[PDB]
Amino acid sequence: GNPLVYLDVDANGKPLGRVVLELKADVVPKTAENFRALCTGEKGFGYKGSTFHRVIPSFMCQAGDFTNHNGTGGKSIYGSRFPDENFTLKHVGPGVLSMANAGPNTNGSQFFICTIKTDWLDGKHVVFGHVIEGMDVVKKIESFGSKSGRTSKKIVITDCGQLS
Numbered sequence: 001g002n003p004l005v006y007l008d009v010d011a012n013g014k015p016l017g018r019v020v021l022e023l024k025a026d027v028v029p030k031t032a033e034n035f036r037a038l039c040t041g042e043k044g045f046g047y048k049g050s051t052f053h054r055v056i057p058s059f060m061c062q063a064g065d066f067t068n069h070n071g072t073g074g075k076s077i078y079g080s081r082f083p084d085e086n087f088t089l090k091h092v093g094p095g096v097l098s099m100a101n102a103g104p105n106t107n108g109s110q111f112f113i114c115t116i117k118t119d120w121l122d123g124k125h126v127v128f129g130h131v132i133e134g135m136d137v138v139k140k141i142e143s144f145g146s147k148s149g150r151t152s153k154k155i156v157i158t159d160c161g162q163l164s
C-alpha cells in the first residue's frame with residue numbers, strides 16, 4: 001500500500017503534535033519515494049531538525065529547506081532537482097501535500113501543506129499526498145504565520161519517519 005509518514009512539530013520548543021501524511025505512490029511513485037526517504041533519513045540527510053520557514057494564513061505552510069533554512073535550498077534523493085512527474089492529482093482542499101518549486105522541473109525537497117483549496121496551482125505544483133491525521137496541528141502552525149510568510153514562532157520538525 002501507500003506509505004504513511006509522520007512529522008512531529010514543535011513551536012519555540014513546545015510540542016504541537018504529530019501530522020500523519022499518506023503519500024500517493026500509486027500515482028506519483030518517484031515524488032512519493034523522495035519524500036518518504038527524506039522522512040526516514042535513510043540516505044544520510046532529510047527533514048529532521050528543519051523548519052517551516054514560510055507560513056501564510058488561509059493559503060499554506062511551507063517547509064523542507066534543510067540546507068539553507070530560507071526557501072533557497074534543499075535537495076532530492078536523486079540529485080539537486082528532479083522533473084515534474086505528473087499533474088494528475090489536484091489541489092482539492094485543505095490538507096493537500098504538494099511540491100514547492102522555482103518553476104517547471106525544479107523539485108527538490110521543499111513542500112507545502114495547503115490550508116485552503118489552491119486550485120490556481122493545479123498544473124504548476126505536483127500534488128503527492130494528503131494529511132490523514134493532525135489537521136489541528138496544521139491549523140496551529142497556520143496561526144503562527146503572517147501575510148509576508150514570516151513566522152512568529154520557530155516551527156521545527158523535531159522528528160519524522162515512516163509508519164507503514
Ligand SMILES: CSCC[C@H](NC(=O)NCc1ccc(N)cc1)C(=O)N1CCC[C@@H]1c1ccccc1SC
Pocket residue numbers: 060062071072073074099100101102103106107108109110112
Ligand atoms: C511564486 S514564488 C515561487 C513558488 C514558490 N517557491 C519557493 O517558495 N521557493 C523556491 C524554491 C527553490 C528551490 C526548490 N527546490 C523549491 C522552491 C513555491 O513553491 N510556493 C509553494 C506554495 C507557496 C509558494 C507560492 C506559490 C505560488 C504563489 C505564491 C507562493 S508564496 C508567496
